[PDB]
Amino acid sequence: NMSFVKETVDKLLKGYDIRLRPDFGGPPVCVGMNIDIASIDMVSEVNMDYTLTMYFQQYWRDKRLAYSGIPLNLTLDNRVADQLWVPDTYFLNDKKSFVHGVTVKNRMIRLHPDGTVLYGLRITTTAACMMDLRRYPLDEQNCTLEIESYGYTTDDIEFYWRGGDKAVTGVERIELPQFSIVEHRLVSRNVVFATGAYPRLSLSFRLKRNIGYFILQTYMPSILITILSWVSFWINYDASAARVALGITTVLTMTTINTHLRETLPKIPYVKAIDMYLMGCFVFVFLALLEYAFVNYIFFGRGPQRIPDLTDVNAIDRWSRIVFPFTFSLFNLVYWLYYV
């Protein structure tokens, strides 16, 4: 048994040239790929990337490795991969990645009698995706993973998804705390550079951000502060200290709400959907404070000289008691219909 297997495996590597791909100087070698996704984590808008753990299996035929007389698929110790040709697959958008190495290098080489090689790697890769945050936190991102051959063109190597649409598994078991993976899809194409045309496999996910976290942390605190700025409409116009303190505090609170949200995001130059709401709530609490200044100026600035009446101080307060809750509801009605 083991004498024959050891004799056979030694025979395969004797005279093997790792510098030459299978069918070197001939037809392209076809490499099929399966990805089993272990997890997705650290989807960072700050860093514009996501971290992916996966089992990255590659399949190809090397007729130099065909063996006979052994009705077995030979799973060899993974160090034999240093003695064999393997595809020079790389991830174009991969910022940082490693093959896990405990307790050994998380790598698998399985030979088959006809010369087929199954080569699996356990890889954690931090791949870059640039996120369009104009609809944040109601945004829907699309993060990919480009898979390409570095030095071998379509004349030397061909990529395909093994199993077609079933080539990637484990997507339905991924739990992202902030997202739900709406869809994933698989793309095969060629990419042209100045050095040749290279086969590319593309795996992309569509992440829809969950909104429940931002209701509790940003939207409900803003609505309650905006509502509490309307309390000044029922306070007597004489109580200037009370209404200014109520007015100033809500304007201050809106900034404090915005700063907490501001500090956990990149410095994108455009206005996000969350900024539109916070700016909207700021306008409402600012106008409420300006409403008392108008009430104060009408009574004291113009009183001695002697649509709301604009001369009756209590008429302006009665008008504001209706318009501000109505308009804010109208603002929330428009904002949520546009973004949900």
Binding site: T89, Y90, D94, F193, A194, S240, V244, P269, F286, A293
Partner: protein, 349 residues
């Protein structure tokens, strides 16, 4: 397969990869071009930036001439470690990565005349010294210098593969900038002098202009609204002493918080940026509103405001402060004029 194995074995038989091609006869000439797959984020605090490149080099090695069934030998990267390759390094680089997932991202191609093509995927983090006087309306030319580490210009020289402007190519979709616009790149060549000789340097300058949108939303607009808020108190009656004092004190406290929090992402430079000047003038307007009211309060004769019933002839009541009436115009007007001057000054630089 033995045909190509015998060719590779013959090439490496008696080959000394410690010796550069032409060592003792001529200068090795390395043609270089760069394909930028992504111009990564710029870090103001570290005064650096990230760039992802296909770094391509090409040189002639007469020891690697061959005749065979093919005119180009497309080999895996492990052949590159068997031959001589240039020792190129980035002069302003900080912590660069030569990616090797899942294998070393390198390609080596040998043509029958000995010409070698040698490209590698690199992530370079390079220094970009910044002058932040005009921040956040500033522009920078981030350099990317490289050359041989050990070989002087009498041994190794670098040249651009094509027209120098066309030898650095940025991908259409390859932009990881969040707050900058890549306006283009200027490509040059030069000679640097060290303690070990004269070296050829290949230089690329990436011209970046900062996008002001974030700082308008997070700093300029809150400052402008605080200044407008501080001037609301000019329209309150002079007898609302607790009310107008809260206006003045709170707005100063807000300006202090804005001023302190506005340099978080910047290096602690010793000069004033354009934003520091804006916050200073906004602080001055906010501070002067509280000084304005304290002057108004100093001439309030009576502690009670107008009751809304008694006629005021010309008991007695305080009159509307003349300082308030002038402040209701002068303060909004001087701040509008300052913004016109401030924005025309820096948006035109």
């Amino acid at each position: 397969t033995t045909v190509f194995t015998r060719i590779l074995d013959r090439l490496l038989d008696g080959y000394d990869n410690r010796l550069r091609p032409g060592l003792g006869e001529r200068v090795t000439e390395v043609k270089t071009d760069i394909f930028v797959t992504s111009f990564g984020p710029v870090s103001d605090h570290d005064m650096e930036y990230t760039i992802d490149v296909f770094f391509r080099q090409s040189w002639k090695d007469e020891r690697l001439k061959f005749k065979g069934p093919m005119t180009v030998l497309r080999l895996n990267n492990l052949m590159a470690s068997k031959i001589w390759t240039p020792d190129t390094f980035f002069h302003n680089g900080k912590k660069s990565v030569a990616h090797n997932m899942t294998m070393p991202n390198k390609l080596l191609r040998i043509t029958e005349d000995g010409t070698l093509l040698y490209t590698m995927r690199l992530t370079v983090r390079a220094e970009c010294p910044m002058h932040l006087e005009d921040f956040p309306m500033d522009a920078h030319a981030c350099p990317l210098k490289f050359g041989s580490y050990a070989y002087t210009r009498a041994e190794v020289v670098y040249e651009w593969t094509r027209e120098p402007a066309r030898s650095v190519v940025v991908a259409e979709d390859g932009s990881r900038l969040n707050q900058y616009d890549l306006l283009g790149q200027t490509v040059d060549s030069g000679i640097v002098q060290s303690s070990t000789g004269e070296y050829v340097v290949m230089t690329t300058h990436f011209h970046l202009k900062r996008k002001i949108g974030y700082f308008v939303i997070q700093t300029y607009l809150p400052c402008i609204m605080t200044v407008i808020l501080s001037q609301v108190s000019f329209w309150l009656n002079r007898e609302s002493v607790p009310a107008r004092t809260v206006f003045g004190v709170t707005t100063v406290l807000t300006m202090t918080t804005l001023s302190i929090s506005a340099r978080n992402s910047l290096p602690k430079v010793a000069y004033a940026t354009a934003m520091d000047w804006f916050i200073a003038v906004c602080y001055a307007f906010v501070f002067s509103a509280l000084i304005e009211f304290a002057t108004v309060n100093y001439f309030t004769k009576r502690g009670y405001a107008w009751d809304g019933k008694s006629v005021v002839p010309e008991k007695t009541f305080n009159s509307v402060s003349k300082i308030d009436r002038l402040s209701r115009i002068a303060f909004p007007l001087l701040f509008g004029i300052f913004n016109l001057v401030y924005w025309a000054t820096y948006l035109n630089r």
